[PDB]
DNA sequence: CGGTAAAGTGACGTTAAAGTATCGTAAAAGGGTAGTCACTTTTCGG
DNA sequence: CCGAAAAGTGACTACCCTTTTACGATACTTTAACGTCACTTTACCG
């Protein structure tokens, strides 16, 4: 997710304090070791954060001395740009997460289409008396009705051989079997009957 | 297609060009660069090798980095930016997004035919139908499936009739069963027993 | 959680057994011959034959080959394989994947929109570097607007900003007034700079 | 872009000949080196192509007797089966080209947006001013006109500092400089002036 | 009171460690190769 | 004319080579800490 440098984190924190006014312009800061203990960091790590601010003309520290705040206006500008552009950073990170996730989806797609082709080949390899099958997952006035109430053969030309409901099968279902949403209908007919069944159950 | 070494180069060229490093001021070479940019000394060294190759600085003094000319640093910045991507980078990203949008449209249509080329989905379950040859005399011959009311008589769902070697799939109630036809139907073993009895086939094993 | 060629071998051989092409008594060819017929490794063929062995469709205690065991259990295995593998279920997954990818790209499009909006355009760090003069000398051109002076036609300069009493107006237009002591920021070349200096009596 | 084993090619070729009738049913496909010489291929790749044929039950094999042709109807059916499924597989191979190019453009997008962030922080470190740069790449009633004819400052609030045309820059352009399609316009102003310039030159660009 | 020297503290620079990424090597599998094995056909001899 | 032997070819198999994928190791980069150096302040002495 979001990771920044600890050095940067310290720099941003102290720059925010300066911009808020805790450290006024011209405020002395003979520091290193004291603020290092405030931040529970090695005294040396403190400078790693405060000379980056000096080259950026936010403060001035002579050798062996304390940091003197220089420009309120420029420290404010820098802190603002950094935080709003670290929001630029968070948006950037979300784009990289999104594109990597999409590469993950497209890799799954690759294996799916290879697997799809493999199954189409293996399924064709038999041919005893293959029937036609659909999943009635869309809303339709034909759901919650029995096969006889629908009068299926007269509506679509299909002969239903089996209904799968909640993973269970009824073969040779008869007129009293009910077709419910999500059920699988196995049926025989030709390509036109398959097309009729798809339209009849609002499947495309 | 770029690494942060270029960014270092631009940053230090910017300092030189603004006048932050006065004309002829010396840097502490790798140590100063690493302390400033947080970049490693090995990348930094190539970063400054860039400005050496363009004569913005000289490194023949192991001590550090001597800056040479502010005018050449400004030249560097300009050509660098123009040959790289800034407002072009915004345009390139837009072009990339639109190219991928078109590629996805092509993909959507490809898959449509791929899926529609499957004009049906089969199962090859054990639901494959029993086959009986109605070769014996029977009161049921010469009648239509609907007149017989077959499912209610035997529990069978007829999927096809073979008559004179020709098949009718999904036969409906008006198809007639004639002597010698083959009836294909789904059911279980008990449905098979009912069909065999119904059509006077008790002789068959 | 379903990817295998050995399963394709398993179903193929089970379909042969169940249809009756391979009678019960009959022996299958060598594990190496089946691997070559199905164009795969002997090891994957070993997995396929182990599948039907675990389902008691074949036994391999003989080196000559695999002996067929049960035609009905091959049929029993075809039913279970149908369930596990699934047919249009596979197609449906591809449609869902495509739909999810389209939504992910819509999210990406909007993300980039804000990223690019930012708030403004950009910069090319050009030597456009605008000149600055301070109009501190007396001049008949002071107390006049940029349009009244017709500056570009007089000096070749394009004024980008005026500083007046320490405050800035950027893109000033023809109605902005140049007063004594103001700073004029402008673009042009060295000759334009020279014209501006002379024009405002800065020699 | 085609990856069918050599064996499989050999099988298809000889099966096609059988289905055409060049190799009749009782006629024996004898001479294995002689079959290798027919296609100038190795005799063992040919022998195995024929073996895969024999195992799909198109021809029968036996010592001393060249492969005898068994069934016309089934060899014909199998030829047609390979004809459909192989093009199905080629269509599958196509979606692969799409996913590959798109993954490449995503890896490309990732680098582009990383550098875009790099540019934003780099330009945030500016000097007195950074003029907005627009590329007038869209069709517009304003193209082919001079800055003075357009009366740009009064239309948009922008002061144009330079035009880039055919890679050449004119600084301090004046009213007689013309804006042509594809030019880069550099101008000063604020965020609102930028919005006016973008609208004025038909750059909504969604 | 002024100057000098010493000590202490803060900063800067350099080096080391840890984590992540990339590349190379190795292993496994899938597909082609020649050697061997057997069977059938042809020729010769009885 | 029939039988036997030899030769040629089909059938068989163990193997080898090539390609792809996965894992491991090395390298690089970033962040932290130890050490050393400089500057400032104080105290003491002249
Ligand atoms: N292929 C077949 N196999 C076995 N028997 C068949 C049959 N076709 C028709 N019948 C029999 O004839 C009756 C009328 O069939 P019909 O198709 O007109 O009218 C049918 C049909 O439109 C529909 N239906 C019933 N089962 C169906 C199924 N499995 N598939 C499609 N439609 C079915 O409900 C109506 C009443 O069905 P019900 O079973 O009470 O009554 C059925 C049934 O006893
Ligand atoms: N670089 C530019 N960017 C944007 N628009 C430009 C432009 N150059 C010319 N125009 C537009 O064309 C009009 C006539 O410009 P011209 O240079 O002849 O006549 C100008 C010019 O001599 C002078 N002027 C105005 N603004 C100026 C400026 N920022 N710098 C220098 N001269 C300016 O006053 C006259 C009237 O100015 P006004 O703005 O009413 O009208 C301007 C303006 O609308």
Numbering used by the authors:
A (entry chain B): 7 to 210
B (entry chain D): 9 to 213
C (entry chain C): 8 to 210
D (entry chain A): 7 to 212
What does the paper say about this structure?
BusR is a member of a yet structurally uncharacterized subfamily of the GntR family of transcription factors that downregulates transcription of the genes for the BusA (OpuA) glycine-betaine transporter upon c-di-AMP binding. BusR satisfies the overall domain architecture of the GntR family with its N-terminal winged helix-turn-helix motif (wHTH) and a C-terminal effector binding motif, an RCK_C domain (regulator of K+ conductance). Our structural data, supported by biochemical and biophysical data, reveal that BusR utilizes a unique domain assembly with a tetrameric coiled-coil in between the binding platforms, serving as a molecular ruler to specifically recognize a 22 bp separated bipartite binding motif. Binding of c-di-AMP to BusR induces a shift in equilibrium from an inactivated towards an activated state that allows BusR to bind the target DNA, leading to transcriptional repression.
While the resolution of the EM density is not good enough to determine the register of the DNA directly, it can be deduced from the lower resolution BusR:c-di-AMP:pAB1 structure, as the whole dsDNA density (46 bp) is visible. Compared to the crystal structure, BusR undergoes major structural rearrangements upon binding to dsDNA. In this complex, wHTHfree faces the DNA in the same orientation as wHTHinhib but is positioned one quarter of a DNA turn (90°) further inwards, towards the middle of the DNA sequence.
